[PDB]
Amino acid sequence: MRGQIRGLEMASKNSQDGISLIQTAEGALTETHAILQRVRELVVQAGNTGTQDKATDLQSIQDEISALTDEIDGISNRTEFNGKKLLDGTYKVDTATPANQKNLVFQIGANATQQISVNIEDMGADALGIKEADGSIAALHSVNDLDVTKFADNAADCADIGFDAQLKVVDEAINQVSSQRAKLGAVQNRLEHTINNLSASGE
Amino acid sequence: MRGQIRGLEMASKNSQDGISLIQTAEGALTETHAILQRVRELVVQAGNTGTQDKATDLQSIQDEISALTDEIDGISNRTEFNGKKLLDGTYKVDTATPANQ
Amino acid sequence: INHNIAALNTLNRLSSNNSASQKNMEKLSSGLRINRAGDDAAGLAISEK
Amino acid sequence: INHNIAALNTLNRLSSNNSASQKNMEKLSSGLRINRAGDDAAGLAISEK
Amino acid sequence: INHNIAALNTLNRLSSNNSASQKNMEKLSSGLRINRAGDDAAGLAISEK
Amino acid sequence: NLTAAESRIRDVDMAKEMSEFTKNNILSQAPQAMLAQANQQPQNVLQLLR
Amino acid sequence: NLTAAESRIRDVDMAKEMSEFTKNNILSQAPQAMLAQANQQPQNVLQLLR
Amino acid sequence: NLTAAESRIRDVDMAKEMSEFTKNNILSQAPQAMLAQANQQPQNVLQLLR
């Protein structure tokens, strides 16, 4: 019994550390999110203002979107929690193989197998989830931001340089943010209720 | 008489251990309970919001409900009291037979 | 007893209450019921959109 | 705790709110939404031209 | 006996209790469960980082 | 009206969350005093059973 | 939130460590009186077996 | 804007430094009472081991 009580208390510590981690990465994705809101403001405002704006003006906005870009790489990179670049999109990709996943498991029970699985995948190079960074689109309008002068060449129809690919990349990118944040918060629910069973059962 | 007194005292110990066991499993079911309250909040909130929500959004909620799900398996499993997975539903089923109770 | 005390529940209820009043602080502070957490994941992702 | 407190978020939300009400001051004061900052860079450079 | 007494255990349990209440003092005093000792070495080195 | 929709997720019934704020505060000041009583009773074991 | 992580190592459940503080104090006042009794019983060996 | 730069060295987050002010005050009222307990325990050595 003392075995189970001690191990369970230290397990409560473990779980609270998990709550800390997921809280950090979550707030990081919150910042990513609000930034991408500003990005969509700059894709509507970089609607060429139809064509009312100039390649000069859109070069200016594009400088802004590269600043915010490397800020998003900044979120996916600076999040070195205990030295873990958790929002390294590399860190936990399912990959359709066990070749390299690095499942960010947690340990809960004072007995064996009582573990949790965690999934953390975002990066500034992550956008519309075709499978991966498709090409110049579906990851790299987040990174490279085709609104330089390609977006003056056309604005509707070419499906790569025509506002619609781009705004769609922003949309699904932000939805990837949403989905992962929902996963993280789900984990936080499980850890709260988990500490409740640990603390009262252990009591 | 000393037979009955001694055996009865140790029986009091036995019964208090029983109170301990049932107290543990009970609090475990309390946690299960409150979790399922949240589940009904997520079945009303997963009323599709009528249909106002999306399959994306409900995929998110469903991720949450699978988390809470394996938490409920977590209660029915982690409750290894003296090594007894008491909330193993298997452990004491009546089964309509004495084959295994 | 002199070895365990039985108001350990009190510590757990005080801990949960710390989570509660702290939580209500966090919401009144920002003036927001939406969670930074993915808690209320659909409310989050919808409101984001 | 007695070592950290948890309404540090409150300091951050109050800081952001200082940025916000200060910002709205700066705009109402000059009577201008245009930023001295290159914030709204295209609105700036266009309006300059 | 008149040569040894058998509540020497009592001295050992009182000594351990001195370590215990002294320990809880040291933690409540600083307001810290972290040990100056490398006791909880990983909690230490992590929290340091 | 979309902003109305935005509110009805994120908006706070500040009266409500104040009520739960002080409710929780009361239930965080109370069990403290209970912990006092629990950590005060055995003193009479030491001092009056002995 | 890193500071939250910093707390969940170093932070004290002051109620808890107070409970173990007085618990240990009681178990440090008790065995003392036991040592009294042990260092008091053989006096009746000297004074009543002799 | 230079004055802004002047502030971002010398300026005080008065909320912050108030938080550390009362935090430190609490951690200066606490160890005092601990010093009481430490300077009160051996009295039972004198008075109950003896």
Residue numbers in the entry:
A (entry chain W): 52 to 254
B (entry chain g): 52 to 152
C (entry chain A), D (entry chain J), E (entry chain M): 3 to 51
F (entry chain A), G (entry chain M), H (entry chain C): 255 to 304
Kindly provide excerpts from the paper associated with this entry.
There are three parts to the flagellar structure: the trans-membrane basal body that functions as the motor, the connecting rod and hook, and the flagellar filament that acts like a helical propeller. Our current understanding of supercoiling in bacterial flagellar filaments, referred to as polymorphic switching, is based upon the notion that protofilaments within the flagellar filament can exist in two discrete states, that differ slightly in length. The “short” state results from a protofilament having a right-handed inclination (the R-state), while the “long” state results from a protofilament having a left-handed inclination (the L-state). To reconstruct filaments at high resolution, all protofilaments must be “locked” into the same state, either L- or R-type, producing straightened filaments that lead to non-motile bacteria.
While the three L-type mutants (E115G, S285P, and S17P) have a left-handed 11-start helix, the four R-type mutants (N226Y, A233V, H84R and A39VN133H) have a right-handed 11-start helix, and the designations L and R correspond to the hand of these 11-start helices. The L-type 11-start helices are tilted left by ~ 1.7° and the R-type 11-start helices are tilted right by ~ 3.9°. Strikingly, we found those sites are not necessarily conserved among different species or participate in unique inter-subunit interactions. These include three straight mutations outside of the D1 helices: S17P, S285P (both within D0) and the double mutant A39V/N133H (within the loop region). We also detected two mutations, S17P and S285P, located in the middle of the small coiled-coil D0 domain. These two residues are not conserved in other species, and proline is not found at this position in any wildtype species. Therefore, mutation S17P or S285P in B. subtilis forces a local bend of ~ 30° in the helix axis, and this conformational change makes the D0 coiled-coil adopt an L-type form more easily. Here our high-resolution reconstructions expand our knowledge and we can now observe how mutations in D0 can cause a switching of the flagellar structure.
